[PDB]
Design a binder for this molecule. Structure first.
Ligand SMILES: N[C@H](CNC(=O)C1=[SH]CC(Cc2ccccc2)=C1)C(=O)O
Length: 288
């Protein structure tokens, strides 16, 4: 049985409690089809002070539908869990030494706590040094989320490039967003500003934008465009940048890679990804 690791990230992965009986609530799409749900174990509370308890939860969304298809197509069984530290994955020092390790899903995949990462996981060369990716299952980029009415053009807007305290922007901790900001000369000063204010999760950053505590949130367009389309008070602004894909993650020299990529190819070829888009990404007007 493959150990699949994933992360809470709407609309790709929804995470909800079980009912009192341990079952997942019966739900239907707008088209009337049952929402496919899998059990996923993971931490139930992320609040500072609150104890961690790893409990069965209910998972569903674009990525779970993709998983279900993959497992059928390639004839594997699986069990899903949520990444224990809540992170996508960057490199960090081990015990403040010069040796480095990955945190997040990257870290679990490398340690064997997972066999496959099935998530909105950005393909990039830093991570590709350590793991294999499928071909992209979705093409996307970064964009910026703001409150409706905020006057920002994009990543080269002087309010970002020449920041005062009057305008706070941020991304998510231990995602690939920081290092690619660091590695750019034109964006080094933004990395300096942001590492001070970054959020533990996308959900918390989004909420901070709604609550006027964060003026701009830099994050995946596949996510922010959905969020802004679901919430009438939030918008995205500027051109996509750092265009890149989401891929399935596997250990180097995994025997699964070729067949995973072939599955993803078929899904781009035959309308399946577009069907998923129509189920999870664009289907109704804002209401949340
Ligand atoms: N999906 C999340 C967050 N998204 C990111 O970290 C991103 S999206 C684009 C980007 C930079 C880049 C530049 C060139 C080539 C590839 C990526 C970083 C993750 O996996 O941590």
């Amino acid at each position: 049985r493959l150990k699949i690791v994933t992360i809470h990230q709407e609309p790709f992965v929804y995470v909800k409690p079980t009912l009192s009986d341990g079952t997942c609530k019966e739900e239907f799409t707008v088209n009337g089809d049952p929402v496919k749900k899998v059990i996923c174990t993971g931490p139930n509370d992320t609040s500072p002070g609150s104890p961690r308890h790893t409990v069965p939860q209910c998972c569903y969304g674009f990525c779970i539908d993709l998983l279900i298809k993959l497992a059928r197509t390639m004839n594997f069984t699986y069990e899903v869990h949520l990444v224990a530290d809540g992170k996508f994955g960057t490199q960090e020092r081990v015990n403040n030494s010069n040796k480095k390790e990955w945190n997040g899903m990257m870290g679990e995949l490398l340690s064997g706590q997972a066999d496959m990462i099935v998530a909105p996981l950005t393909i990039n060369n830093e991570r590709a040094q350590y793991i294999e990716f499928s071909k992209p299952f979705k093409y996307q980029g970064l964009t910026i989320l703001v409150k409706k009415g905020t006057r920002i053009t994009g990543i080269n807007d002087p309010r970002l490039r020449n920041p005062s305290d009057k305008f706070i922007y941020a991304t998510v901790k231990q995602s690939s967003v920081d290092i690619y900001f660091r590695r750019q000369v034109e964006l080094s000063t933004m990395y300096r500003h942001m590492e001070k204010h970054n959020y533990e999760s996308a959900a918390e950053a989004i909420q901070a934008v709604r609550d006027n505590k964060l003026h701009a949130f830099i994050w995946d367009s596949a996510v922010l465009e959905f969020e802004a389309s679901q919430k009438c008070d939030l918008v995205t602004t500027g051109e996509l940048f750092f265009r890149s894909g989401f891929g399935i993650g596997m250990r180097k020299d995994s025997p699964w890679k070729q067949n995973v990529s072939l599955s993803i190819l078929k899904s781009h070829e035959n309308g399946f990804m577009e069907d998923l888009d129509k189920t999870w990404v664009r289907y109704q007007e804002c209401d949340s």
